[PDB]
Structure formats: structure tokens, C-alpha cells
Design an enzyme around this catalytic site. Structure first.
Site, PDB file in Angstrom:
ATOM      1  N   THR A 297       0.881  -1.233   0.092  1.00  0.00           N
ATOM      2  CA  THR A 297       0.092  -0.200  -0.088  1.00  0.00           C
ATOM      3  C   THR A 297       0.913   1.434  -0.112  1.00  0.00           C
ATOM      4  OG1 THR A 297      -1.754  -1.113   1.411  1.00  0.00           O
ATOM      5  CG2 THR A 297      -1.726   1.418   1.236  1.00  0.00           C
TER       6      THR A 297
ATOM      7  N   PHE B  39      -1.686   7.205  -1.657  1.00  0.00           N
ATOM      8  CA  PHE B  39      -2.688   7.662  -2.798  1.00  0.00           C
ATOM      9  C   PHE B  39      -2.682   6.402  -3.672  1.00  0.00           C
ATOM     10  CE2 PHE B  39       1.231   8.561  -5.323  1.00  0.00           C
ATOM     11  CZ  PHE B  39       2.105   9.058  -4.225  1.00  0.00           C
TER      12      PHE B  39
ATOM     13  N   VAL C  78       0.033  -1.224  -4.942  1.00  0.00           N
ATOM     14  CA  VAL C  78       0.703  -2.525  -5.960  1.00  0.00           C
ATOM     15  C   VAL C  78       0.107  -3.604  -6.022  1.00  0.00           C
ATOM     16  CG1 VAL C  78       3.005  -3.686  -6.533  1.00  0.00           C
ATOM     17  CG2 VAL C  78       3.073  -1.138  -6.167  1.00  0.00           C
TER      18      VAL C  78
ATOM     19  N   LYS D 201       1.264  -0.893 -10.018  1.00  0.00           N
ATOM     20  CA  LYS D 201       0.839   0.408  -9.386  1.00  0.00           C
ATOM     21  C   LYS D 201      -0.272   1.061  -9.787  1.00  0.00           C
ATOM     22  CE  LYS D 201       3.668   4.165  -7.431  1.00  0.00           C
ATOM     23  NZ  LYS D 201       4.891   4.507  -6.993  1.00  0.00           N
TER      24      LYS D 201
ATOM     25  N   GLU E  71       7.765  -5.187 -14.320  1.00  0.00           N
ATOM     26  CA  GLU E  71       8.441  -6.536 -14.027  1.00  0.00           C
ATOM     27  C   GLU E  71       8.138  -7.138 -12.571  1.00  0.00           C
ATOM     28  OE1 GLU E  71      12.173  -7.129 -15.571  1.00  0.00           O
ATOM     29  OE2 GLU E  71      12.696  -9.026 -14.559  1.00  0.00           O
ATOM     30  N   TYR E  72       7.654  -8.115 -12.522  1.00  0.00           N
ATOM     31  CA  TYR E  72       7.423  -8.795 -11.099  1.00  0.00           C
ATOM     32  C   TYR E  72       8.528  -9.525 -10.532  1.00  0.00           C
ATOM     33  CZ  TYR E  72       5.576 -11.642  -7.503  1.00  0.00           C
ATOM     34  OH  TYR E  72       5.192 -12.301  -6.185  1.00  0.00           O
TER      35      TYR E  72
ATOM     36  N   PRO F 182       9.617 -11.904  -7.582  1.00  0.00           N
ATOM     37  CA  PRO F 182       8.985 -12.823  -6.781  1.00  0.00           C
ATOM     38  C   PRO F 182       9.618 -12.975  -5.495  1.00  0.00           C
ATOM     39  CG  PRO F 182      10.417 -14.037  -8.415  1.00  0.00           C
ATOM     40  CD  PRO F 182      10.319 -12.446  -8.832  1.00  0.00           C
TER      41      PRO F 182
ATOM     42  N   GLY G 275      10.178 -10.818  -3.089  1.00  0.00           N
ATOM     43  CA  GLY G 275       9.717  -9.924  -2.205  1.00  0.00           C
ATOM     44  C   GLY G 275      10.696  -8.763  -1.780  1.00  0.00           C
TER      45      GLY G 275
ATOM     46  N   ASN H 142      12.025  -0.307  -0.658  1.00  0.00           N
ATOM     47  CA  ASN H 142      12.047  -0.278  -2.177  1.00  0.00           C
ATOM     48  C   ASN H 142      12.931  -1.108  -3.043  1.00  0.00           C
ATOM     49  OD1 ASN H 142      10.223   1.757  -1.592  1.00  0.00           O
ATOM     50  ND2 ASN H 142      11.443   3.440  -2.340  1.00  0.00           N
TER      51      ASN H 142
ATOM     52  N   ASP I 151       9.751   1.881  -7.246  1.00  0.00           N
ATOM     53  CA  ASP I 151       8.995   3.022  -6.613  1.00  0.00           C
ATOM     54  C   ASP I 151       9.939   4.463  -6.839  1.00  0.00           C
ATOM     55  OD1 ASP I 151       7.434   4.804  -5.390  1.00  0.00           O
ATOM     56  OD2 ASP I 151       7.089   3.745  -3.691  1.00  0.00           O
TER      57      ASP I 151
HETATM   58 CL1  GVP Z   1       1.646   2.730  -4.045  1.00  0.00          CL
HETATM   59  C1  GVP Z   1       2.770   1.627  -3.404  1.00  0.00           C
HETATM   60  C2  GVP Z   1       4.343   1.927  -3.583  1.00  0.00           C
HETATM   61  C3  GVP Z   1       5.324   0.846  -3.319  1.00  0.00           C
HETATM   62  C4  GVP Z   1       4.812  -0.417  -2.820  1.00  0.00           C
HETATM   63  C5  GVP Z   1       5.742  -1.384  -2.682  1.00  0.00           C
HETATM   64  C6  GVP Z   1       6.147  -2.388  -3.690  1.00  0.00           C
HETATM   65  C7  GVP Z   1       5.986  -3.556  -3.625  1.00  0.00           C
HETATM   66  C8  GVP Z   1       5.958  -4.449  -4.733  1.00  0.00           C
HETATM   67  C9  GVP Z   1       6.662  -3.713  -6.061  1.00  0.00           C
HETATM   68  C10 GVP Z   1       6.980  -4.700  -7.296  1.00  0.00           C
HETATM   69  C11 GVP Z   1       7.385  -4.182  -8.458  1.00  0.00           C
HETATM   70  N1  GVP Z   1       7.827  -5.301  -9.113  1.00  0.00           N
HETATM   71  N2  GVP Z   1       7.558  -6.590  -8.147  1.00  0.00           N
HETATM   72  C12 GVP Z   1       7.208  -6.183  -7.308  1.00  0.00           C
HETATM   73  C13 GVP Z   1       6.879  -2.355  -5.970  1.00  0.00           C
HETATM   74  C14 GVP Z   1       6.578  -1.615  -4.912  1.00  0.00           C
HETATM   75  C15 GVP Z   1       7.180  -0.692  -2.063  1.00  0.00           C
HETATM   76  C16 GVP Z   1       7.283  -0.233  -0.896  1.00  0.00           C
HETATM   77  N3  GVP Z   1       6.714  -1.062   0.325  1.00  0.00           N
HETATM   78  C17 GVP Z   1       5.500  -1.653   0.129  1.00  0.00           C
HETATM   79  C18 GVP Z   1       5.617  -2.292  -1.273  1.00  0.00           C
HETATM   80  C19 GVP Z   1       3.427  -0.656  -2.832  1.00  0.00           C
HETATM   81  C20 GVP Z   1       2.477   0.303  -3.177  1.00  0.00           C
END
Ligand code: GVP
EC number: 2.7.11.11
Lengths: 20, 337
Positions: B38, B41, B44, B59, B108-109, B111, B113, B158, B171
Site C-alpha cells: 500500500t 494515494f 501495488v 501500481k 516486471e514482477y 518474486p 519480496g 524499495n 518506486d
Molecule cells: Cl503505492 C505503493 C508503492 C510501493 C509499494 C511497495 C512495492 C511492492 C512491490 C513492488 C514490485 C514491483 N515489481 N515487483 C514487485 C513495488 C513496490 C514498495 C514499498 N513497500 C510496500 C510495497 C506498494 C505500493
């Protein structure tokens, strides 16, 4: 110990960004 | 030659920078699977692309909330920059689009964490473990800074661990393309350079400071300046006093003294020789910078995975509706998105 102080602190979780 | 790669890298970036890709997908091309986290605003989610069966991190930003939090220019910055960059240790955009109420960025995902989750569980990393990750941050910042980009939010939260155990910085909500100095008070308290705290104009040197905080936190298991409230933390940052654990190697201490240097003319990365001061420091002596960029180095930790779209390395968050109004919100503000 410093570790113990950290682990006992309110900031061991995900830390939020700041703004104005 | 670092110079030659970066010259081409900049040619690639500028073309996408001046002509941003736009509207490259739509919501119903994606199966929503799970929330990975989360933000103020938005959030993800893991999603699957129906056309390819590829899994992606999406996002989702609420336009109205973006406006309320005064993050319009910053969010435009994020999308504009991410669609333009390309580097192994960054999650760049694969798609972006918007609808009546939301903005969407697909990447790109990863896995494995967040580094954060693993660092906290395991306690702390070995210096070789922390050096493996640091090198990838050193190279990413080299890349970003050559493009005139400041990242401004380095932290374990991040940094995503991929299937091979390499990092992806993600992020870029606070990333900005700027020649010269900028003034926004932004970032995360533990990682803020003194310049930011003292409301001075600052530049990319703040990223090298935050590298120093990360390396410390990785090697120590806690940050160099912590407390219960942000103001207690800023007190500590500006003071110019860091204590290192007794297990910290002499070389590590020296590196960190030079990254965590309040004096801008002395801070590594900010000197006449730029990033090489960091790269040729003794603590990185064993680092093969090319092998690291090529992903030829054996990662000290490879994440557990059971098939694609696996989310066991991420925490559980309450799943919430994506509602799409019949009325367009904030059309003007986000016209270029
Ligand atoms: Cl809005 C938002 C921003 C960042 C995240 C987080 C995030 C999780 C996963 C991914 C992600 C991108 N690609 N694979 C995973 C990006 C950012 C990073 C900061 N900590 C909480 C999770 C979630 C929601």
C-alpha cells in the site's frame, strides 16, 4: 544493546516517506 | 569502458524522455491476483497479462488522492522517467495507462519480496552479502545520475529481490530529472542527508549519503540513526556522529565514514573522481563490477518460489475494490500521463 533498543523501538516496520 | 555504455544509455534515454510512451494497455487486459503493498494515494498488485500469461507488478494510483497529497508533478515525474529508463537493477515500465479515476504503471514482477522483509527476518547480512547488493545500487546510481536523475528514496522497502537473487530498485515517486540543485523536502527520515533536513538546495550527493545508510543497515541490522520519532532521528543525522558495531570491518567503517560525511566536499560520489572513489575503495576490492552487471556473480541468497505468480515472499494486505467512476477525474492535471 543497540539491537535491543532498535527491536524495542516503534520503527522496525515499513517506514513511510515524508512530505511537507 | 563505462564512458561508452553510458553515452549510448543516454542516447536511448533522451529519445524516450522527449517522446513518452502513452496508453499502451487497458485494465481488462489484466487479471488482478493479489496486493503486494500500500501507499498513501495507491497500491501495488500482482496481476497476470491475459494476452501473454506474463505476471506483472501493477501500481494503481488514485488521481484524486494524488492531487490532495500535492504529488501531481512527482507522479508525472515517476511515469515519465520509468518509461524512459532501462537497467538490470530497476523495475522499468512495461505498460502505463489511465482511466476515469486511476493511473496505472505496470512493471516486471519480482518474486523474492522486499529486501526489507528478509533483512528484518534474518537480522543482518554478512559484509559479502551486503556488498553484493550495494554493488547493484552503486551501478544503478551511476546510471541514474549520468541521466541527470536523482532517486531520493533509497531504502530496503524499495528494493525487490528477483528470481536470481539480484535487486530491482522500485518506486520512483520522488525521482526527478534536474541539472543543478533542488529543494523538495522528501524521502524517508532514517535516510535523509543533512542538506535535506537543513532546507538547503541539494543534488545527487543525497543519494550517496542514503547508500551509506543502507549499507550500514544491511550490515548492522538497524540504521545508523534511529529513534521513536522523526525529530529525534534528524537530531542524530545532523550531529555528525555515527557508531559502528564491533563486528564492522575496518574497511567498512572507512567506506561509511566517507559516504556518511556531512561535509559535501569530502563525501564520496560528490568528489572530482565521482563514483570511482566508491568503486575503487578497499571494501569493494573483490567486486567484479562487470560480472555483477552481467548477473554472472553467484547471489548469496536465492528466493524460494513455487511456480510463477507466487506471492509467499510478500505480506498479506486487505484486498480492496478498484472502482472506476463513469466520470473523468483530474483530466487536465494528468493529461500528459
Ligand atoms: Cl503505492 C505503493 C508503492 C510501493 C509499494 C511497495 C512495492 C511492492 C512491490 C513492488 C514490485 C514491483 N515489481 N515487483 C514487485 C513495488 C513496490 C514498495 C514499498 N513497500 C510496500 C510495497 C506498494 C505500493
Amino acid at each position: 544493546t543497540t539491537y535491543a533498543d532498535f527491536i524495542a523501538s516503534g520503527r522496525t516496520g515499513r517506514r513511510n516517506a515524508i512530505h511537507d | 569502458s563505462v564512458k561508452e555504455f553510458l553515452a549510448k544509455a543516454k542516447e536511448d534515454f533522451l529519445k524516450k524522455w522527449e517522446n513518452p510512451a502513452q496508453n499502451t494497455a487497458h485494465l481488462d487486459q489484466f487479471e488482478r491476483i493479489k496486493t503486494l503493498g500500500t501507499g498513501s494515494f495507491g497500491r501495488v498488485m500482482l496481476v497476470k497479462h491475459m494476452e501473454t500469461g506474463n505476471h506483472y507488478a501493477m501500481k494503481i494510483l488514485d488521481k484524486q488522492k494524488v492531487v490532495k497529497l500535492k504529488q501531481i508533478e512527482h507522479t508525472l515525474n515517476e511515469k515519465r522517467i520509468l518509461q524512459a529508463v532501462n537497467f538490470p537493477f530497476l523495475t522499468k515500465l512495461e505498460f502505463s495507462f489511465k482511466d476515469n479515476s486511476n493511473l496505472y504503471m505496470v512493471m516486471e514482477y519480482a518474486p523474492g519480496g522486499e529486501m526489507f522483509s528478509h533483512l528484518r527476518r534474518i537480522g543482518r547480512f554478512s559484509e559479502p552479502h551486503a556488498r553484493f547488493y550495494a554493488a547493484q545500487i552503486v551501478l544503478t546510481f551511476e546510471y541514474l545520475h549520468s541521466l541527470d536523475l536523482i532517486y531520493r528514496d533509497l531504502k530496503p522497502e524499495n528494493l525487490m529481490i528477483d528470481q536470481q537473487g539480484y535487486i530491482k530498485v522500485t518506486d520512483f515517486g520522488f525521482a526527478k530529472r534536474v541539472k543543478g540543485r533542488t529543494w523538495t523536502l522528501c524521502g524517508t527520515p532514517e535516510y535523509l542527508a543533512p542538506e535535506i533536513i537543513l532546507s538547503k538546495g541539494y543534488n545527487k550527493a543525497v543519494d550517496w549519503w542514503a547508500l551509506g545508510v543502507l549499507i550500514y543497515e544491511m550490515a548492522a541490522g538497524y540504521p545508523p540513526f534511529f529513534a521513536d520519532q522523526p525529530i529525534q532521528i534528524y537530531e542524530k543525522i545532523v550531529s555528525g556522529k555515527v557508531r559502528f558495531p564491533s563486528h564492522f570491518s575496518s574497511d567498512l567503517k572507512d567506506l561509511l565514514r566517507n559516504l556518511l560525511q556531512v561535509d559535501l566536499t569530502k563525501r564520496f560520489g560528490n568528489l572530482k573522481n565521482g563514483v570511482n572513489d566508491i568503486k575503487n575503495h578497499k571494501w569493494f576490492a573483490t567486486t567484479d563490477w562487470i560480472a555483477i552487471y552481467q548477473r554472472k556473480v553467484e547471489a548469496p541468497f536465492i528466493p524460494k518460489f513455487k511456480g510463477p505468480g507466487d506471492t509467499s515472499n510478500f505480506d498479506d494486505y486487505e484486498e480492496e475494490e478498484i472502482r472506476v467512476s463513469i466520470n473523468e477525474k483530474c483530466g487536465k492535471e494528468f493529461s500528459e500521463f
